[PDB]
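Assemble and predict.
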Amino acid sequence: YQDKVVDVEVSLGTQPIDTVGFETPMFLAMHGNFPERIRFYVSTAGMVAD
Amino acid sequence: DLAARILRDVKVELVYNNSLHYVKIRASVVLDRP
């Protein structure tokens, strides 16, 4: 038995996937300015704010 | 890249126009020509 005169399936093969990036460096300094373990900055003006 | 919608490899080339700073000239005086 069937319940539809017309039936259509649609499947999406466009799933994005996580990737690694070989750009961002890290510097492991000594301080107590912020509680978390890592902070990202785009300019020194941001660092001076913290 | 299509999935993430990111285009990367655009490239461009330019030729800057250098101004002139110094000049050197060679002159000569002759009486005739073969």
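The CA atoms of residues 5 and 15 of chain A lie 31 Å apart.
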